[PDB]
Amino acid sequence: RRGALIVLEGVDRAGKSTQSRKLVEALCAAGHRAELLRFPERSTEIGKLLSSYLQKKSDVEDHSVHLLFSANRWEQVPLIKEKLSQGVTLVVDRYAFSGVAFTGAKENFSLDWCKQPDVGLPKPDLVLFLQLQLADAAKRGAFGHERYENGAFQERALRCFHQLMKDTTLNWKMVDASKSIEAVHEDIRVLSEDAIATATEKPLGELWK
C-alpha cells in the first residue's frame, strides 16, 4: 500500500527542519517505513548552483533561478514515486509552495507564472504549514546570512503562502509552531499518522492539475 507524501512548509525559523527530522523518527519508531527529503536538495549539480545562489557566492537572474528550484524537484520525482510505491512515507522539508512563495515575493512575478514549472509534480497527501510569529520567530535567534533572510522579504512570501492556501484541493493543515518542540511534534505526528492511514487508499495525485 503506498506511503504518504507529507510536506512541511512555513516561514524561516518556524521549525520545519527540526519537526521534519523528528517526524521521520517517530514514524519509524511506530513501525512505519519513512524517510526524509528536503528542497532544495543541494547535492545534485543543480542543487549546488542553488546552494551557491542562496549563500550569495553567486547571482542568478530571477527567472532562471526559479526554474532551477523547480527542476531540482523534478529530478527527484522518479525516486519520490518509487519510494511511495514501495510503502515508504516521505517527509519533505519544503516543496513547490516555498518555490512559488519566495519567487512570487519578488516584483513582477505572477503567482500563475511561478506555479507552472511545478504543475504535474507528485501531489502531497498532507501539507503542514508551521505558523509562527514572524517576530516570535526572530526570537529564534537571528536571520541567517542567506538570500531572502530578512523581514520584509519574509512578509511578502507569507502573503504568497496565504494565496496558495486558498487551494481547497490540497490538504493543508495549520500547525501552531509557537509551542515547544515536543508539543509541535506531537500535533504533527498525529495529523501525519492520520494522513498515512488514508493515503494507502487513494492514488498519488498530480500537483496543481
Helix axes 151-164, 96-104, angle to 10 degrees: 120
Which residues ranging from 16 to 45 are in contact with Mg ion (CB under 5 A)? Answer: 16-17
Note whether 97 binds ligand TMP by CB under 6 A.
Answer: no
Note whether 78 binds a copy of itself by CB under 8 A.
Answer: yes
What does 168 bind: a copy of itself, ligand TMP, ligand ADP, none (CB cut-off 5 to 8 Å by kind)?
A: none
Note whether 70 binds a copy of itself by CB under 8 A.
Answer: yes
3-state secondary structure of 11: coil
What does 12 bind: ligand ADP, a copy of itself, Mg ion, none (CB cut-off 5 to 8 Å by kind)?
A: ligand ADP
In 3D space, the residue among 167, 179, 193 whose CA is nearest the CA of residue 14 turns out to be 179
- Binding flags for a copy of itself, 35-64, as an x/- string (CB under 8 A): ----------xx--x----------xxxxx
At its nearest, how many Å lie between Mg ion and the CB of residue 200? 29
3-state secondary structure of 6: strand
Residue type, 195: A
Note whether 8 binds a copy of itself by CB under 8 A.
Answer: no
Residues 6+ apart with CB under 8 A from 45: none
Q: How many distinct helices (H) and strands (E) make up the chain? A: 8, 7
- Pick the binder of ligand ADP from 16, 38, 66, 73 (CB under 6 A): 16
Which residues ranging from 34 to 53 are in contact with ligand ADP (CB under 6 A)? Answer: none
Q: For residue 26, give the C-alpha cell.
A: 517517530
In 3D space, the residue among 106, 92, 107, 124 whose CA is nearest the CA of residue 17 turns out to be 92
Cell 503562502 sits at which residue?
A: 161
Binding site for ligand ADP (CB under 6 A): 10, 12-18, 140-141, 177, 180-181, 184
